[PDB]
Design a binder for this molecule. Structure first.
Ligand SMILES: CCCCCCCCCCCCCCCCCC(=O)OC[C@H](COP(=O)([O-])OCC(O)COP(=O)([O-])OC[C@@H](COC(=O)CCCCCCCCCCCCCCCCC)OC(=O)CCCCCCCCCCCCCCCCC)OC(=O)CCCCCCCCCCCCCCCCC
Ligand SMILES: CCCCCCCCCCCCCCCCCC(=O)OC[C@H](COP(=O)([O-])OCC(O)COP(=O)([O-])OC[C@@H](COC(=O)CCCCCCCCCCCCCCCCC)OC(=O)CCCCCCCCCCCCCCCCC)OC(=O)CCCCCCCCCCCCCCCCC
Ligand SMILES: CCCCCCCCCCCCCCCCCC(=O)OC[C@H](COP(=O)([O-])OCC(O)COP(=O)([O-])OC[C@@H](COC(=O)CCCCCCCCCCCCCCCCC)OC(=O)CCCCCCCCCCCCCCCCC)OC(=O)CCCCCCCCCCCCCCCCC
Ligand SMILES: CCCCCCCCCCCCCCCCCC(=O)OC[C@H](COP(=O)([O-])OCC(O)COP(=O)([O-])OC[C@@H](COC(=O)CCCCCCCCCCCCCCCCC)OC(=O)CCCCCCCCCCCCCCCCC)OC(=O)CCCCCCCCCCCCCCCCC
Ligand code: HEA
Ligand code: HEA
Ligand SMILES: CCCCCCCCCCCCCCCCCC(=O)OC[C@H](COP(=O)(O)OCCN)OC(=O)CCCCCCCCCCCCCCCCC
Ligand SMILES: CCCCCCCCCCCCCC(=O)O[C@H](COC(=O)CCCCCCCCCCC)COP(=O)(O)O
Ligand SMILES: CCCCCCCCCCCCC
Ligand SMILES: CCCCCCCCCCCCC
Ligand SMILES: [Ca+2]
Ligand SMILES: [Cu+2]
Ligand SMILES: [Mg+2]
Lengths: 56, 184, 66, 73, 139, 143, 551
């Protein structure tokens, strides 16, 4: 869950999701199988925040 | 095209924070009306040779804080950091200056249990000093966030709302400084 | 007195609770009456299916009559 | 247990027998009741022991009755 | 958003009138002169509505009519991303626990517990502020 | 064609209303009996990994060809087992998809027919459905 | 057209469906539910305190309580009801429907919203934790008059925990008020103008403004009291003028605080009356002006609680206090006008709202009696005062609270509470409340002061005290049917498959499923008035409402 809320033209409120794997033709991600490893829950931990800028 | 939600939330809270200082102001005025003619009474001797330079430093910190806002609105994270570091240093100097005033006032017999004037003076100025310390913490926390991710508009919003609190703190001190050191 | 005071405090709320419960809890609720076999099935057709497992060639079936 | 109740049922110990928790709860309440035997002269603590033991017994009985009738599994 | 500050300006005028009237009415034919506690509260109560109203007045005249400020806007006019809203966070309960620890220390006057509470609050507040800004681990 | 107080929304959903003090479901069965059947359906399907369905209404004149059409409405009909009951027709039609073939439904489906019929003679509709679902689900393997 | 359904909806979620959500949720719907359960637990806790006092006051002489314990009881009983039940449940109803009412997907600050709940839960626990200390909890009354609260006169740690517990909870209330102002200003749906919002949304926004004025000054006063008790300061020293200094600040907080828990419940019945009358709210525009006038007037009438001190300007506060009765009277005429020439069915949400009108009026009529200093000179600090704020709080924070609970339970749960059990609960509550509080008008007038642990057999107060004790225990047993209804109807209640279980809802929450999805809306309708859901469900009535709107 990226935390970004979007209003559809007909008034629907949906939250943008970041898939961790392949997606469908409709856009919904393919469900993944648990592998005993921790799963990301924050977009900033996936590198969405970028870097401030090289320098002092 | 829309109002800044964080700015509205900060301004709304800043207005409520003023009522907290209203209670402290009421205590000072209530004790002043019961002074009987001596306000401040002996042996309290306020000196403006230190309060005035300390007050001027806090006022000058607002200008450099505003300069950081201009850099933040310009997208220059490095300009924002330079001005906010300078603002933090002068804000720290204000705390040290107030504490140095506190030490000499205590040595001369002006303390919280010592007199009614000491109670209102230290509560009013001390709680403001706590607000200054909280503002210095906000500067450090915001500047630490500047090294974590790229300079985004939401990050620039956080810089602006922090300056709102700093401007509120500076304006409150001017009311406190004029009411205590001039309207005796 | 003292026995009357404790009797009213402990007795009236329980008596009032029983009287008011008999008035209201004995009434018929909005729930429909259980269907009876002797009566015709006048209700709309009902299709019930389980949600598990979470998400047309037939493989066979059977007949029956009671 | 099924994966519908405990998603990681096949990854570790995920089931504890209900008899262990039921008998443990009954022994839990019994130990609270036997602690009224002592040198203490007050009875405020005794009523606290009685209340906690009664609550534990009521919870155990409710769980057992609901599992017996089949409302919970 | 012209209605929102008109609400605060209306409150501002009444609070200013009450603060002025109370101060004058307590200055005359009232024992002890001006009653400072109520006068100070009323004067700065006007300040609360004045700051919020003035800010809303400046924001309103900058931006044009919003879809929720239109008298005949369509639902499709609001299409687009609204903003960032946190999906989940256990930091808020830690902040309250940190603040409650300091309050208990202040209630019983335990300076060590107060110091621990203040340190806990700072760490808890830092976690909330940095929660959605921490980068990936670097190894 | 929509009922009173019902509207078609911009997303295609139907926004319906009910009069105050009235019910939106109103099945002619006790609430607790419905819970038992739902538990039998939910846990019976879980134990066999096949969606169990129950139908109560008419079945045309040749019940067997109506059940067949009805099973197309069940989600994942290929892995579904439907029990159709027609009080007015006094019959019991049971249909299952191709994915259930060879998993033991052939032995269990007549047993579910017999279990439902026995309780129906006593005037118990919900009890008959519960009994039929339980025996059929116990005889179907998750294979 | 055969659509598969379950025979019954799922009773409860699987194992682990709630515990991690409770400590990590940012959803206002779950948080609002979390505010109702905890506030209803505190209401039960505080009610037990009143039962202990009321049992003790049944007979002359101290049968089982001491003077100290009784003094601790009404202090904590009042603190729990006013600050731990009434004030938070204002934000309890706010998180339930206000984002739905304005067509918003979430509150402005979801994490700050969650912080308020925990600040409020741990702050309340700190103050209540005084009862486990050997000395006991606070015993100086919820007013905490000075210098009775000074360390000389209140040296125990129970008072200190009371001060610090209030400060923590007050911070959460301030943050909640900040959240609600921002949410109304910035999260409105397209086409939802300021003068199209529901009255409940208007009441909450105006109430949140009152919070920002009242609660910070209370926090400032409490910190000054803490300085006196721990640092030996002279803030509230009588020689320094601190007797009236504490009273002025505390009542500048307190009287705006009782409309923080009045106006939102005025909005709740304002939502319920149009639905069950099949008519639009009467004087929608004027009700907003009445609410604004009530909020503005409540800030400058604080000293009518200090008539007997002989240190306040009587004509100023007496006149402005009389002015408040005018907008409050306007609200009655709008509520009656809404019910006038309608089609009333009197369901449980409507039945509780009607009880509010009957109960609130008598307490209100006692208010104008108290607003005159000459009459207050005899009835202040007596049980007549106790009768005023009990008739006038009970109507708002109990009758309207129960009306809102019954009204919005299908919306937030998808299940309907039993009406037969609800009618029993309402009548038990009504009869018990009136029985226990009607005779207290006579007791205060006869000469029985408030906050007395004991009286004498020759005082002539025994008969009326016994009658009040009988009624109070009816209020205690009135609690069981509602708790049973909530416990049973939350898993086995009648399923709700429609958007509006009450048929004629007007606000936007009735235009979505029961319960609403995570983001509250899968679509939004065209907003053209203050009844968007009624227009959506009854398009043919759109022409009629515009034509018949004016008499
Ligand atoms: C009244 C009592 C209150 C009721 C009970 C108290 C509950 C309060 C605790 C809330 C925190 C729960 C929590 O973290 O669970 C989520 C956490 C992670 O779940 P997840 O979302 O799946 O994260 C995995 C992600 O894939 C991984 O992705 P990610 O990036 O989201 O996860 C990493 C993330 C988090 O990584 C973790 O997994 C760390 C979780 C442990 C945090 C421990 C905090 C306590 O970042 C960190 O690693 C940060 C860790 C830094 C810890 C510093 C905390 C400072 C504490 C300051 C407050 C002082 C308290 C004062 C109280 C004193 C008086 C009572 O689960 C746990 O590990 C649960 C174990 C914690 C049990 C606590 C028991 C002690 C409570 C008693 C206190 C009273
Ligand atoms: C040392 C060992 C001592 C063990 C102590 C055991 C005591 C507990 C006994 C017990 O429950 O056992 C079963 C129980 C297992 O329960 P379960 O089958 O897993 O789940 C219960 C279901 O959720 C069944 O559902 P439920 O109906 O019981 O629960 C419904 C309700 C709970 O409802 C009630 O309890 C209300 C009761 C109302 C009156 C009754 C009405 C009449 C009944 C008819 C109603 C029809 C339904 O709570 C919920 O489930 C909903 C959660 C939402 C929270 C709402 C709470 C807000 C209330 C605020 C107040 C205002 O055991 C435990 O949970 C374990 C706890 C203790 C075990 C420790 C020992 C382990 C052994 C260690 C190994 C090493 C030794 C060698
Ligand atoms: C101090 C710290 C205390 C120690 C920690 C708490 C102990 C355990 C807590 C826990 O695990 O909770 C979840 C836990 C279940 O954990 P889970 O596995 O995540 O959930 C499984 C469920 O199937 C999940 O089913 P579900 O999620 O579908 O449940 C639906 C419904 C089920 O509803 C029911 O079963 C009936 C609800 C109770 C009736 C309410 C009485 C009427 C009040 C008026 C309400 C107006 C609305 O319950 C709710 O949705 C209630 C949610 C809101 C509850 C707010 C709780 C406050 C949180 C603050 C502390 C943390 O609850 C239990 O099963 C506990 C059983 C008995 C608990 C008795 C509690 C009495 C203590 C008084 C509390 C009042 C505050 C003072
Ligand atoms: C105290 C109350 C102050 C907060 C009230 C402002 C409301 C504005 C709403 C807002 O934006 O919420 C941000 C956010 C709300 O979470 P959210 O819903 O995810 O908001 C997302 C936003 O849309 C997106 O916003 P964002 O992610 O960009 O973050 C916005 C944030 C970013 O601000 C920063 O860059 C850092 C500011 C963090 C606050 C520092 C706390 C200082 C504590 C000092 C303790 C020692 C003394 O800016 C502000 O919150 C503006 C306030 C400026 C700081 C003034 C506070 C000085 C305290 C004075 C002490 C007396 O919360 C915060 O980050 C701050 C609230 C934490 C309150 C702590 C409560 C404990 C205080 C007790 C202290 C006593 C110690 C003894
Ligand atoms: C604000 C809301 C509110 C509510 C709802 C109430 C509720 C009640 N109060 Fe009030 N009260 C105040 C607000 C309120 N109170 C305030 C502000 C004061 C000021 C005190 C002061 O001076 O400081 C006050 C003080 C006060 C007095 C004055 C006492 C004195 O001065 O000596 C009295 C007199 O009887 C009273 C009685 C009652 C009774 C009988 C109820 C009935 O509601 C109680 C019945 C309700 C119950 C909930 C019973 C509980 C039943 C159970 C079955 C509980 C079981 C629970 C467990 C076992 C965990 N309270
Ligand atoms: C829900 C909370 C609540 C509300 C809404 C009110 C509303 C009012 N209250 Fe107050 N009050 C309290 C809570 C509340 N109060 C509490 C808790 C205390 C004591 C605190 C303590 O000591 O612990 C208190 C005490 C208190 C005092 C001090 C008593 C004393 O201690 O001596 C006074 C005196 O002025 C007062 C007056 C009023 C008036 C005039 C209103 C008005 O708002 C009511 C007006 C309503 C009507 C008048 C009915 C509608 C009008 C009409 C239909 C038109 C009729 C017109 C006329 C009759 C002219 N109340
Ligand atoms: C947190 C609390 C801070 C500690 C405050 C304190 O104890 O200060 C009072 C103390 C007076 O001590 P006294 O008995 O007069 O003896 C002094 C002899 N040199 O010394 C003082 O008077 C110093 C006061 C310093 C002001 C601090 C302001 C604190 C504000 C929040 C309260
Ligand atoms: C207290 C130090 C004051 C120093 C004077 C100058 C003021 C500006 C300092 C800027 C620091 C930048 C650090 C940074 O970017 O690190 C960032 C991380 O910092 C932190 O997480 C903690 C920062 C310190 C927390 C402060 C808590 C207590 C505050 C006390 C206030 C008195 C960089 O993270 P990164 O690994 O690069 O993503
Ligand atoms: C539901 C109305 C209850 C009314 C209770 C008041 C009764 C007063 C009786 C007084 C008797 C004096 C001897
Ligand atoms: C607005 C004032 C209401 C007064 C109600 C009085 C109740 C009747 C008590 C009768 C006692 C007779 C001894
Ligand atoms: Ca007695
Ligand atoms: Cu008042
Ligand atoms: Mg008095």
């Amino acid at each position: 869950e990226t935390g970004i809320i979007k209003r559809l033209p007909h008034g629907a409120y949906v939250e943008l999701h970041q898939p961790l794997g392949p997606v469908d033709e409709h856009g919904h991600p393919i469900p993944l199988e648990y592998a005993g490893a921790p799963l990301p829950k924050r977009m900033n931990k996936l590198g969405s925040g970028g870097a401030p800028g090289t320098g002092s | 095209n829309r109002p800044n939600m964080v700015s509205v939330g900060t301004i709304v809270w800043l207005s409520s924070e003023l009522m907290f200082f209203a209670g402290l102001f009421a205590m000072y005025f209530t004790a002043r009306a019961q002074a009987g003619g001596a306000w401040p009474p002996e042996p309290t001797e306020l000196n403006l040779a230190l309060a005035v330079p300390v007050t001027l430093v806090l006022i000058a910190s607002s200008f450099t804080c505003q300069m950081g806002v201009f850099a933040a609105e310009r997208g220059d994270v490095f300009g924002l950091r330079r001005w906010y570091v300078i603002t933090f240093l002068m804000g720290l100097f204000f705390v040290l200056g107030q504490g140095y005033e506190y030490i000499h006032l205590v040595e001369h017999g002006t303390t919280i249990p010592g007199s009614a004037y000491g109670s209102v003076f230290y509560l009013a100025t001390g709680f403001h000093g706590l607000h200054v310390i909280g503002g210095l913490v906000a500067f450090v926390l915001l500047l630490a966030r500047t090294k974590m991710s790229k300079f985004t508009p939401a990050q620039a919003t956080a810089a602006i709302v922090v300056s709102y609190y700093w401007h509120f703190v500076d304006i409150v001190w001017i009311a406190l400084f004029a009411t205590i050191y001039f309207v005796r | 007195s003292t026995a009357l005071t404790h009797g009213l405090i402990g007795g009236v709320p329980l008596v009032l609770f029983a009287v008011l419960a008999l008035i209201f809890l004995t009434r018929k609720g909005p729930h429909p009456d259980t269907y009876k076999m002797s009566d015709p099935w006048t209700h709309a057709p009902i299709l019930w299916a389980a949600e598990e497992p979470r998400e047309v060639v037939i493989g066979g079936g059977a007949s029956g009559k009671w | 247990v099924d994966v519908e109740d405990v998603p990681s049922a096949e990854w570790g110990w995920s089931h504890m027998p209900i008899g262990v928790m039921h008998i443990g709860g009954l022994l839990s309440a019994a130990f609270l009741l036997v602690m009224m035997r002592g040198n203490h002269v007050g009875h405020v603590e005794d009523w606290f022991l009685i209340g906690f033991a009664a609550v534990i017994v009521a919870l155990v009985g409710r769980n057992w009755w609901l599992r017996r009738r089949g409302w919970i599994r | 958003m012209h209605i929102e500050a008109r609400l605060f300006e209306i409150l501002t005028a009444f609070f200013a009138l009450a603060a002025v009237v109370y101060a004058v009415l307590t200055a005359m034919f009232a024992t002890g002169g001006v009653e400072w506690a109520g006068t100070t509260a009323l004067v700065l109560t006007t300040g609360l509505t004045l700051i919020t109203g003035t800010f809303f007045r400046f924001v309103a005249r900058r931006l044009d009519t919003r879809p929720e400020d239109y008298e005949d806007a369509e639902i499709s006019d609001g299409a687009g991303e609204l903003g960032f809203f946190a999906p989940h966070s256990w930091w808020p309960i830690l902040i309250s626990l940190s603040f409650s620890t300091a309050a208990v220390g202040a209630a019983l006057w335990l300076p060590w517990l107060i110091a621990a509470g203040v340190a806990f609050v700072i760490t808890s507040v830092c976690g909330l502020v940095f929660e959605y800004y921490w980068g990936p681990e670097k190894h | 064609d929509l009922p009173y107080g019902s509207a078609l929304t911009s997303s295609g959903r139907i926004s319906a209303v009910t009069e105050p003090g009235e019910l939106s479901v109103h099945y002619p069965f006790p609430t607790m009996d419905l819970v038992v059947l739902d538990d039998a359906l939910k846990y019976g399907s879980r134990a066999a990994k096949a969606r169990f369905a129950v139908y109560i209404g008419p079945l045309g004149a040749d019940t067997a060809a109506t059940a067949r059409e009805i099973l197309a409405n069940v989600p994942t009909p290929e892995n579904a087992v439907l029990l159709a009951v027609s009080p007015d027709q006094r019959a019991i039609e049971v249909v299952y998809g191709a994915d259930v073939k060879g998993r033991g439904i052939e032995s269990a489906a007549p047993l579910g027919v017999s279990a439902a019929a026995a309780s129906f003679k006593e005037g118990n509709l919900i009890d008959g459905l519960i009994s039929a679902v339980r025996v059929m689900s116990a005889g179907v393997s998750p294979a | 057209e055969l659509e598969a359904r379950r025979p019954f909806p799922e009773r409860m979620g699987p194992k682990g469906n709630l515990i991690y959500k409770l400590i990590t949720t940012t959803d206002h719907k779950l948080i609002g539910i979390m505010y109702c359960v905890v506030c209803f637990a505190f209401f039960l806790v505080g009610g037990l305190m009143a039962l202990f006092m009321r049992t003790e006051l049944a007979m002359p002489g101290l049968q089982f309580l001491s003077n100290e314990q009784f003094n601790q009881l009404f202090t904590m009983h009042g603190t729990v009801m006013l600050l731990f039940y009434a004030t938070p449940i204002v934000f309890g109803f706010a998180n339930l429907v206000l984002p739905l009412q304005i067509g918003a997907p979430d509150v402005a600050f979801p994490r700050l919203n969650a912080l308020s709940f925990w600040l409020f839960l741990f702050g309340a626990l700190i103050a209540i934790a005084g009862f486990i200390t050997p000395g006991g909890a606070a015993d100086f009354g919820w007013t905490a008059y000075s210098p009775l609260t000074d360390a000389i006169h209140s040296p125990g740690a129970g008072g200190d925990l009371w001060i610090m517990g209030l400060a923590v909870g007050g911070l959460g209330t301030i943050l909640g008020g900040v959240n609600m102002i921002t949410t109304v200003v910035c999260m409105r749906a397209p086409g939802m103008t300021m003068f199209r919002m529901p009255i409940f949304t208007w009441n909450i926004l105006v109430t949140s403004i009152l919070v920002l004025i009242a609660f910070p000054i209370l926090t400032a006063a409490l910190f000054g009291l803490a300085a006196d008790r721990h640092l030996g300061a002279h803030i509230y020293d009588p020689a320094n003028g601190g007797v009236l200094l504490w009273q002025h600040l505390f009542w500048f907080f307190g009287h705006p605080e009782v409309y923080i828990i009045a106006l939102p419940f005025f909005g709740i019945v304002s939502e319920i009356f149009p639905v069950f009358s099949r008519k639009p709210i009467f004087g929608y525009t004027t009700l907003i002006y009445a609410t604004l006038a009530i909020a503005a007037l409540s800030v400058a009438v604080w000293a009518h609680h200090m008539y007997a001190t002989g240190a306040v300007l009587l004509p100023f506060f007496s006149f402005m206090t009389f002015l408040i009765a005018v907008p409050t009277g306007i609200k009655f005429f709008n509520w009656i006008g809404t019910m006038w020439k309608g089609q009333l069915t009197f369901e449980t949400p409507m039945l509780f709202s009607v009880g509010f009108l009957i109960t609130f009026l008598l307490g209100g009529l006692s208010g104008v009696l108290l607003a005159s200093p000459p009459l207050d000179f005899h009835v202040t600090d007596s049980y007549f005062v106790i009768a005023h704020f009990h008739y006038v709080l009970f109507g708002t924070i109990v009758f309207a609270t129960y009306a809102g609970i019954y009204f919005w339970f299908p919306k937030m749960t998808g299940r309907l509470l039993d009406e037969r059990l609800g009618k029993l609960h309402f009548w038990l509550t009504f009869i018990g409340f009136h029985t226990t509080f009607l005779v207290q008008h006579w007791l205060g007038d006869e000469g029985m002061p408030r906050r007395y642990a004991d009286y004498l057999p020759t005082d002539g107060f025994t008969t009326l005290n016994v009658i009040s004790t009988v009624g109070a225990f009816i209020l205690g047993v009135s609690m069981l049917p509602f708790v049973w209804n909530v416990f049973k109807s939350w898993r086995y209640g009648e399923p709700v498959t429609v958007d509006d279980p009450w048929g004629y809802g007007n606000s936007l929450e009735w235009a979505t499923s029961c319960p609403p999805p995570r983001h509250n809306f899968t679509e939004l309708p065209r907003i053209r008035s203050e009844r968007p859901a009624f227009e959506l469900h009854y398009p043919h009535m759109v022409e009629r409402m515009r034509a018949e709107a004016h008499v």
